[model samples]
Target: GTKELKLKKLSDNVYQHISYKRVEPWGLIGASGLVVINGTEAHMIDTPWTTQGTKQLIEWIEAKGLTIKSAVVTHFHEDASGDIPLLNDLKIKTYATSLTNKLLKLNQKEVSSDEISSNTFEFIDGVASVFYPGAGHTEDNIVVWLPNEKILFGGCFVKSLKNKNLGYTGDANISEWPNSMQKVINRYPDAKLVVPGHGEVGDVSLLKHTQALALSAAA
Candidate 1:
């Protein structure tokens, strides 16, 4: 009940842009992180949900290389960005935005920063950049940017591989989600690759499409 998809080269070292098939029927639809390495070491963008899937993906990473130095959880959602304490046990650094850290405190303040195998981080990839693309689905979703490959990881901003009409509004920006992506487009006009947080990997035009959809469907 699986199809083995190979790694797609977003650039030289970054590959696969791995995707997790949703178990809950359109619940996740698609969710996976960027498979990459900082220089020689390997790392991931976000951890997929479910311990079973987490173990499987971790095994997949181990099969590749220990280059995975860190796991960047885009936000607090279990399906999109949970299951990192296990990686914490494995000694990988889990990073979240300052806003995300605060959200954790508001709801799960019992969760200590030191207790979790994670940390607070802001993206600063220079040649390419993982920008703080503002909130779409939640107040702290991050998009991965690769100037080398011109790729932007729009987590939750661009919904599923199929298309998202009304993005989840539990904490959605509803308003900012549209033009916020225009900022990304302005950042990398010729971006060749686009990785949406919850679906199959897409191309740059997908950003424009997502922006348009969000803008058109908003209240």
Candidate 2:
């Protein structure tokens, strides 16, 4: 039902698509959202910059007569899930990792419906999972994995076509980022498609690219 781009069917009725294109202005970190939802119950992964974007995404769901059951924040970064309160207003459950919980606390109102620091591939959904692959842009960053479609909604850990530069220099856990991504690679050994927080989405090669940049910066 999305108009911007062609939606790919991940499962029976679940469709995979992306919204929000991040464009770094000055030194601000660009942010985007990877939307995964269906006709009956809409669930999004990560919100964009502000409450406005959050409201916009909600309208998209309302049009389909679907309610946002749950929303996943890949991390607590300002750009990733900045619309926490907005999500709460619509009564959508928000989930995050252990570290992300601490980061999210800074944002009041949307304390979130639920939060989780660690989880495996085999869970209630069976297809979707937010995995902690260590840290890159931030210590609490997480990647959304859809095993069935081999789609990895990579937070700030992965790179895209335009930007290959690594290290958040100002505040980055360069020391452990590479090793962390290593764990991600092992976990989704079969990831065929990857969606980074910014830029275009593609294959597992993006994972390798992120690792290379990470190692270079830390080294």
Candidate 3:
């Protein structure tokens, strides 16, 4: 998404969507998520910042004759799971890590229970896998890997090359970031494309750069 304005294509099967949210003294910030398409059925990697944005995203997908198979929230942050209610209303299946669900329910009041929370899950019958590679951005942050496409959606666990610092540390495990990142690197050594939660998509070097940043930050 790279804070870009629309659905940007990353590969033959992946598209990144952008949405905005307010951030401290910085005011509004843009966030992006991966929209994975497969024939007429699709899977949403994350959600937009508001219900309206989610609605528009749904409409956008429908207009293209595609339906969401499920929505995966990378973390408990609103930027990633903002439209939980809308997904419920649309009867769409949504998923997240067990920790993500627990943290979200602890933070939000009266949320619907139609979402899936598991340590690991398969998509497109093994085309992709979701894993929680320790913690950095948030205790519950997770990443997705499309082995077939060699694309890794690193979410906030990995940062863009242009990033100067870890975006948010309030809910981060700074000490554990390096180890978490290493796990990611080890898991997807052959990933051709790597995506951060907020910025431009790049290759595997982004993971190494992020690891270097995390190690330096811990120093």
Top-scoring candidate (lDDT): 3
Model 3 weakest lDDT span, ten residues long: 109-118
CA-lDDT, candidates in order: 0.63, 0.68, 0.81
The parts of candidate 3 lying over 4 Å away from their true place are: 1-5, 22-28, 109-118
Question: Model 3: how far is 145 from its true place, Å?
Answer: 0.5
Clashes of each: 4, 1, 0
Residue-level lDDT of model 2, residues 1-219, one tens digit each, is 232223445556454444443346544334556566544666777776655556666776677787678788777765666777777776777777767777667644345667684554322276577777776878788887776677777867777856758635454688888888888888887887777776676787788788888788766
In candidate 2, the residue pairs with backbone N, CA or C atoms under 3 Å apart (3 or more residues apart, or in different chains) clash, namely 98-117
TM-score of each: 0.79, 0.82, 0.90
- Let me know the TM-score candidate 3 reaches against the reference structure: 0.90
lDDT tens digits by residue: candidate 3, 1-219: 223246888888888887766778877666788888888988888888777678778888898899887888888888888887788778888777778887888997324344445656775576678888888889988889998789998888889999989877899898899898888888888999998888788999999898888788889
Comparing 2 and 3 on lDDT, the stronger one: 3
Pairs that clash in candidate 1: 8-16, 30-198, 42-67, 42-68
Q: In candidate 3, residue 115 scores what lDDT?
A: 47
1 or 2: which has the higher lDDT? 2
